From a paper:
The programmed −1 ribosomal frameshifting element (PFSE) of [name]-[name]-2 is a well conserved structured RNA found in all coronaviruses’ genomes. By adopting a pseudoknot structure in the presence of the ribosome, the PFSE promotes a ribosomal frameshifting event near the stop codon of the first open reading frame Orf1a during translation of the polyprotein pp1a. Frameshifting results in continuation of pp1a via a new open reading frame, Orf1b, that produces the longer pp1ab polyprotein. Polyproteins pp1a and pp1ab produce nonstructural proteins NSPs 1–10 and NSPs 1–16, respectively, which contribute vital functions during the viral life cycle and must be present in the proper stoichiometry. Both drugs and sequence alterations that affect the stability of the −1 programmed ribosomal frameshifting element disrupt the stoichiometry of the NSPs produced, which compromise viral replication.
Here, we report the structure of the [name]-[name]-2 programmed frameshifting element pseudoknot solved by X-ray diffraction to 2.09 Å. We created a modified construct of the PFSE lacking the upstream slippery site and spacer region. This structured RNA was then bound to an engineered humanized murine antibody fragment to facilitate cocrystallization. The most suitable location to graft the BL3–6-binding epitope into the PFSE was loop 2, at the base of stem 3. We observe a three-stem H-type pseudoknot structure with the three stems stacked in a vertical orientation stabilized by two triple base pairs at the stem 1/stem 2 and stem 1/stem 3 junctions. G13486 engages in a base triple interaction with G13493 and A13537. However, in this structure we see clear density for a triple base pair involving G13475, U13504 and A13533 at the S1/S3 junction. Interestingly, the 5′ end of stem 1 threads through the ring created by loop 3, a feature inferred from midresolution cryo-EM models (see discussion). Density for residues 13534, 13535, and 13536 is missing from the data sets, suggesting this loop is flexible and not well organized in the crystal. We find this residue unpaired and stacked within stem 3.
Numbering used by the authors:
A (entry chain H): 4 to 139, 147 to 226
B (entry chain L): 2 to 214
Write the structure that this text describes.
Amino acid sequence: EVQLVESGGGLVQPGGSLRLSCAASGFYISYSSIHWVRQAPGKGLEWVASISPYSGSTYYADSVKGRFTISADTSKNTAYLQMNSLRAEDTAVYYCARQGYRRRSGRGFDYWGQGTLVTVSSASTKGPSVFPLAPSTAALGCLVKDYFPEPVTVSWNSGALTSGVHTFPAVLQSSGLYSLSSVVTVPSSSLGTQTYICNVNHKPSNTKVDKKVEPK
Amino acid sequence: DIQMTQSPSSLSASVGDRVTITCRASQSVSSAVAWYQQKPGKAPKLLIYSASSLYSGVPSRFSGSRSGTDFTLTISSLQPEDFATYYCQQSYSFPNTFGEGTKVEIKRTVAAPSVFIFPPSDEQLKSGTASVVCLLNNFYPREAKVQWKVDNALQSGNSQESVTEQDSADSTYSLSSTLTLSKADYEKHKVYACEVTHQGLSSPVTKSFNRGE
RNA sequence: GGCGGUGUAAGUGCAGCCCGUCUUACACCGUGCGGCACAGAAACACUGAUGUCGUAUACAGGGCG
C-alpha cells in the first residue's frame, strides 16, 4: 500500500547542487516525520535530515547544516532534499524514509525509498568498453572496462540467465576509471546449443552494449 | 550528539546459533531505539522499535532488550536468510544517530575455489592494453590469495581483485583478479599463470595458458 | 490545593499583668506559576484533559508593677 519513489541522483562536480525527490503514495506525508538517510559505498547508515508534522520543524546533521534543505510539498505528496555546495564526502546512496505512527511502531522508520546515488567528483563521465571472456562445466564472462561514474548493470541473455552468474563489484583503476567483470558458469555441453550475450547498461553516459561471448 | 557504539562490527555464525548484537548509547536515550536489517543493495528493513517491540511481520526469533543505556538485538536461532548487516538507531535526540553496523555472515564448511583463467580478447589487443582475468569460483572462507606469473616471473602492482558478497544459496564467495599489461608486453611473453592459495587447498593451485593456444 | 487579603476566636515573647506582633482554627474574597506524566496521524511547536511533585514579603516590639 505505501510506496516511496526517489529520483534526482547523479553526478555533479564539487561545489555543485542537486535536488532529490521522494514521491509518496498510500499515506499523506503531512502527518508523518519524513527523514533522509545516506550510505556511502561500503559504509554504514548516516542520518541527514528530517521534517516534523504540524510544525514543519526541520533538523540537520552537523556535516550538512547550512548546505542542505529538507522540504515537503503537500499538494504533490512529495518530499525534497536540496543539496548545495556538494563535497566529495557527500557521495552516497540517499534514502528517504517514513518515521512510522507513534502507537504502531514508535519512532522506527517503517517505509524506505529505493535509494538514489549521488556522486560528487571532477572526473568526466565515460561509457565502458565491453570485452568477452571466452569460454574456458565452463566459465565465460564479459569485462566491462574504463567507465565513470558508477554504476553499470549487467544481465545475461536479457535476464533469462541468472543462475551461476557473478557480477563483481567495480574496482577503481589508477586511471580514475572503473572496471568490473561479470562471469557465469554453465554446463560445457550448453556451449554448443546456447548463445551467451552479456547486456551492459551504463545509464550515466547512455552507453548500452550487448556483447556475444563465443568460444575462442 | 549522542553516540551509538555497536559491537561486534562483524561476526560469522552457523545456522542454528543464537547471536547477540550490542549497542551502547553515550548517554540516556530512554527507550527510543530501533533496529534494522539491511541486505546488500537494498534499503534497510525495520525489525525492532522502542527498544523491545517486534515490528509487524518480523519473525519471533528476533527480539530486543534494554538495560539502561545498553541495548541488545538477539536472534534466538540463526536462519540462512538472516545474513545481513544490522543497525541500531537512537531517535531520542536530533541529530539522529545510527550504530556502525554488524555484518552477519553464515559459517560453512571449507570449500576450495574452482579456478579459471581468461586471456585478453583480440578486440582489446587492438587498443594498446591487455587484461588477463583469473576467476576463483564458489569458495569458503572468504580469505584467498592470488599471485600472477608471466613466464615464471612474479608480478606485483599491476593487478586488482574484487570479491562478491556471500551467496545466498551455497554461502560461498567468488573472486576475480585482473592483471593489466601493455599490449606489447602481453604479445611478447608466452606463459600466463594465476596461482591461488586458500585453506581448501593444501598447497597453492596454478591455472595457466600459453598465448596463442 | 498553595499563596495573599480581610474578619472572628484561642494560644502564644514575661517573675507577673496588658496591647501588639506571631501561630493555629474557622469564614468570606482575590489568585497563580513551574517541572514531570497523557492524548490529539504529534520527539519540537500547536491544541486539549486529568494527575502528581513542587514553588512565592526573612517588617516586632512596646507599656506597667
